[PDB]
């Protein structure tokens, strides 16, 4: 089934009547407007493309402005589309609310993780550091050996080395949905989700049922 696009809004905890406190991530899921519906006849697959939020009138380009005007949908920030499960249908211009998550229990949240920049092997791949004393010289956090000898004669592809860490989309799956608030457009999910505050997130029902 289709997901929804929301914005991460900090974190909080919910106190239950029995005493236990549930850490919850707050996701602001306002109305999602369908801008385009894809069908097997034309696109070879069925999907719905949705938009959310708002954009400055002078900031949206003409190609994007015409695309929204065709669907009669107010311009929003970015576009995302979700594949259909063959059991439901949608129409252009339809608005989708967070209420569809009322009957679900597990969700999958996808977002861009925080960017750590160029990271070393110790931080990136949990490499073990070498001794800080006992004669060690300029080799306290160095990766160490990266190959065997002449017989391979090369470093194998996929070697773990320092490089860019974070700033890629990652998915946290099977997260418990704690509360849904349609009128206030909130979705409380137990746990933590990728990305920093204000980052766009995609929420869909858990697939590992």
């Amino acid at each position: 089934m289709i997901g929804l696009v929301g914005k991460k809004v900090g974190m909080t905890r919910i106190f239950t009547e029995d005493g236990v406190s549930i850490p919850v991530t707050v996701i602001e899921v306002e109305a999602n407007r369908v801008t385009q519906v894809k069908d097997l006849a034309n696109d070879g697959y069925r999907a719905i493309q949705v938009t959310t939020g708002a954009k400055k009138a002078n900031r949206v380009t003409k190609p994007e402005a015409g695309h929204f005007a065709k669907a009669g949908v107010e311009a929003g920030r970015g576009l995302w589309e979700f594949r259909l499960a063959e059991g439901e249908e949608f129409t252009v211009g339809q608005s989708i609310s967070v209420e569809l998550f009322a009957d679900v229990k597990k969700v999958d949240v996808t977002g861009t993780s925080k960017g750590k920049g160029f990271a070393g092997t110790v931080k990136r791949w949990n490499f073990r550091t070498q001794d800080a004393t006992h004669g060690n010289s300029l080799s306290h956090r160095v990766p160490g050996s990266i190959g065997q000898n002449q017989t391979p004669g090369k470093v194998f592809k996929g070697k773990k080395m320092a490089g860019q860490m974070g700033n890629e989309r990652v998915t946290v799956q099977s997260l418990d949905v704690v509360r849904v608030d349609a009128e206030r457009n909130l979705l409380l999910v137990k746990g933590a989700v990728p990305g920093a505050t204000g980052s766009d997130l995609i929420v869909k029902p858990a697939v590992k049922a």
Partner: protein
């Protein structure tokens, strides 16, 4: 990775950085316009403009607190007597930065920082 951190280091230690802003804040008040590098000018807005805000209301405690910064009785006199009343109705933004090319010695991006005054 300095996420959400603020404050330029300017290749100086804490003590040297604090003194340099202290002197160069005092110079700006004295002359009302100085020429510095762009990164230095931007960081000064956060140390000079609070001083003018303090000078808005004249009191013994404020005078002592103002003196503890810039450590100059001339500057303290200049504040509370001219800068204070001049900016009485001004809600911040007492400074203005104007880029003025590059320094010949090392090609440092240079800029003029000057109070919103001197319209005589």
């Amino acid at each position: 990775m300095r996420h959400r951190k603020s404050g330029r280091q300017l290749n100086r230690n804490s003590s040297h950085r604090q003194a340099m802003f202290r002197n160069m804040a005092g110079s700006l008040v004295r002359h009302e316009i100085i020429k510095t590098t762009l990164p230095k000018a931007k960081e000064l807005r956060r140390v000079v403009e609070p001083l003018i805000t303090l000078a808005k209301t004249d009191s013994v405690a404020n005078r002592r607190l103002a003196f503890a910064r810039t450590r100059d009785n001339e500057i303290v006199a200049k504040l509370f007597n001219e800068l204070g009343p001049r900016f009485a109705s001004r809600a911040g933004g007492y400074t203005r930065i104007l880029k003025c090319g590059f320094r010949a010695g090392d090609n440092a991006p240079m800029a003029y920082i000057e109070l919103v005054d001197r319209s005589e």
